[model samples]
Target: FSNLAIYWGQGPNQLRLSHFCQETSLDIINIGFINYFPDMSPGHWPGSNFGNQCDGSVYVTNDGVVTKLLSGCHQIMEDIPICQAAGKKVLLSIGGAYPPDQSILSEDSAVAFATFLWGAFGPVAEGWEGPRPFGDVVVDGFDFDIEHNGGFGYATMVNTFRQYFNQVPERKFYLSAAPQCIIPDAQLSDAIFNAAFDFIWIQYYNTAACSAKSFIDTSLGTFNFDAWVTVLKASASKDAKLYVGLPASETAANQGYYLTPDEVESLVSTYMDRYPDTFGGIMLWEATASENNQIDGAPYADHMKDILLH
Candidate 1:
């Protein structure tokens, strides 16, 4: 999954919208952190910048209004069709590591909020009124990247989205989550286990348990790959796919998290050989770092694509 924080024009490593959509092998792109701060200020946008929401000047109000915060968003929205044409999913990822706890107060509010999201972000929403965040461009789905222990009411939200999917049987509205690699995620454990998710990109970093390094260890360290895989397979739907989420480069994450392309290839190849049907490939943390990471003049993304494909 791709994080929007990379697209902000402020970064020297920012990739153009077109290049980002076509150059990489990413199946899903997550435009992240579209929630409210505990102080009632928007968590996405701080000033003229989109904060962590976008890399460009594109700004979105809490009420679903879209505009440029400074310079034009530089074809950010214009690239949606390009991404979809390439079969890459574009999702509005809600929530992240912030405020300690804040989002979806209760079960009823969860349903109501999900309904509101359907209108604004859904293909054909129930009660969507005038304006929408990205105009009429409907993203593929929503991802719950909730990092805080806000509330378990997100279970109701997931159910509501699933119910809407039942209504529009032709269109698939996905509800996915990014949980910590721990056996039972502290926050989204219940929601992910209860409701069916199309994909579960478990963060295999910041810990030894389930880490890619540990999974690929010759000595079979404390990382219980078999147990994690079993629990995840049983908890999620039969069709639910699991990915090995890892940092893109040496500096992409915490001390023990980062892995080089060679390391990733080694682990992915081993997993493909060992797990076969169970493995759904690899997912890097952010696009910017990966795109900018060049090994002997070759983009890491291209090298990774080669390793994964061949």
Candidate 2:
């Protein structure tokens, strides 16, 4: 998922975004999980970018509100539509790494956000047709990439959103989330996966070890090729779907981890060989990074096709 860091109009990511997906034969790409949020939102505009709980690692600057242009910006196409054109799915992701964005959702805020989002989509969005403001757009799902240990209660916020939005349509929107691979307790992770969501995405880098789910979700360490898949596989809920994310431009190092292509291939192989076919497939930390990374390495582009063609 985009998580909003790339579209902030900085970094060499735009190039990475366009080039990577086409080359890799990818499906879903996150436009951004923007932090138009307050309090628990991802902030630090321009020089102040911080994660959910106010850790200064995220860096947003006053002018950079994610969804902006990059340093060498050019293609800011509504990503979901583009992916759909390619027969891939795209989504607008929400939440932050340290804290959950929806953690503080009040009835007013929930209604307000729903209003804002609905303005972009439509009444109950029978299905995704385009970006908030603009077509033949149908984004596949929503990703809840959050973590509670960082001092933000994202799970609570997500449930807040779900309670309000899930009933908007009878078709059931695709609600997905990414939690830390390790956590202090299971509450944070459980907030979403407990029947409220279809599945969860785990960040291999952050390490949410306190929760049994995280321990069971990860197969490698920071692209390290260490611990085998069997180890982390046992840590998740039997019914949950796992989406292994590989890091791409190095994917901006979250928790100091970048998933390499070889590692991507390794895990893909491991999952297919050892796990049941119910696995949901893999995601790259970003399409932008994978493109910029062409200067060296195997690339997330080719790696994805390699996984699919088999």
Candidate 3:
């Protein structure tokens, strides 16, 4: 069956991770961001901001290394395992529109960042002693929501992450990306083509070339799913799944992209019928908006889940 995914943590009214996990509609929950990665300074560690949920504070580790001290992340940390237990793939999404300067300028920095991520978010490997933002609970994987920094060093970083994933052979560690819908995404084009992403949720909104609005109304702009599929076929992984990413409600995005539940069903059904082999499913922009936007007393994601499963 086709799967449904939604982004959490970014929205102001976003619920705890476990609340979304309990819903039968969602298969994957991408925790919004590890927003800032400052230059490799002594006290500089990556920063993570989850809207009102957690504040990315700095704290010194037992080994004298300063790392991300995610204050108020205890609930999220506790919910990670709950979500995983409920059969949901919870991934730690890195990068977002905020802080505007997040970048992996060099290959060495990418490799180093990858190592930090593995030790922090991946399984507790032997001899790895770093401060885990989410405590001892290992996330299912990482998602690259790279929206800035010119896409530098991302492929190297992903490759390095794969090496760590290989070490933990007992369980699966997925790597996914969310790139803008333009044929060649500005920030993640290289990573999308070069890295072995398990899932690619292309944002079919914001960009006029392939915006969701254009998909429904051709007069607005040109929507090109075929081009994306062609690119996916040439990407590093043949098994990579392609998802149609959209805003959950009119307010979920800036404007012109959000479609009604009926419109979303129509749009997704067209692609699901055309590309059954590669069309993974639909990915909503956020959980809070979907939760608020109701269709006949059900959330937007629930409606999307029905469309995807059918």
Candidate 4:
């Protein structure tokens, strides 16, 4: 079945995670981002920034050592369960365009960070006492939005997370990647092809050659969703669902990428029909823009749900 996913935590004036979960149209929500990677330093810790919602501040000891930072984000802790209860999958997105300092330099570091992620966002393990980011609330999975550093250690990281997922068989944990539309994404090609991803939401905006605009512009001859599909066909997770990522509004991306509801409907229908086996659905760049960019007095995502699901 086709589904709609949206990226939260980066938009301005964003609502609580529960607000979007209440909507029947949305299926997945990716809470971005776990920006800083201190690599388990004594005084420093990894950082998260959820714009206008939580500052991701930690409780520091008197000697200036920082602990896990979830106290200020209690609203998110409460909102996550509400979202999950509504049958929505909530995931933690790990990167963004900002934060040039975010990178896993080694395979060992990647595995270590994966363990930290499980301890903080996944199920709690014995003898590992790090504070949970969501306070006993386990997220559905993780999303790799790695936009920098050539995706050095991501494949190892994904494999490491998969090992932990195997331990918990009661529920399924997913792995997703948001790579730019171009084939062999500079930042995430290894992870997308080498590891087993449950979903791959290819960002078709910002890069005009394969963007939604190019899909309709016959002259461009560059729209390449089929190329992406070919790559996915050979990937480790060939059965992984594919999603067409688009901007929610004009302001959400650079010019020539945002599409009206009618345009989006046409574009998605064409692909869903052409690649039924792998075509999953659409993923909006963000939640706030979709909420604000209304059509016929309805939010963009609501219209998308009607178009793709209903």
On the 0 to 100 scale, the lDDT of residue 252 in model 1 is 69
User: What local lDDT score does residue 98 receive in model 4, on the 0 to 100 scale?
Assistant: 71
Query: Could you tell me which 10 consecutive residues in candidate 4 have the lowest summed lDDT?
Result: 37-46
TM-score of 3: 0.95
Where is model 1 more than 4 Å wrong at Cα? 1-13, 37-74, 124-127, 216-221
Better of 1 and 4 by TM-score: 4
**Model 4 residue 100 lDDT?**
73
lDDT of 1 by residue, 238-310 (tens): 4666677777667767776777777877877776677666566666666777777788886556666676687
Write candidate 2's Cα lDDT for 1-310 as tens digits. 2111112112332443344345435655655544344434433111112122121223233556543111221233344344456655455565444224334345455445434443343333645432333233334555555433332344444455456565567544455666554432243445443334555555555443322223234543233212322333444333455565545544455443654555555666665565554356665555555555663466555556565455
In model 3, pairs of residues that clash are none
* TM match of model 2 to true structure: 0.60
Q: What TM-score would every model get versus the actual structure? A: 0.81, 0.60, 0.95, 0.94
Worst 10 residues of 1 by lDDT: 1-10
lDDT of 4 at 85: 92
Answer with 1 or 3, whichever has the higher TM-score: 3
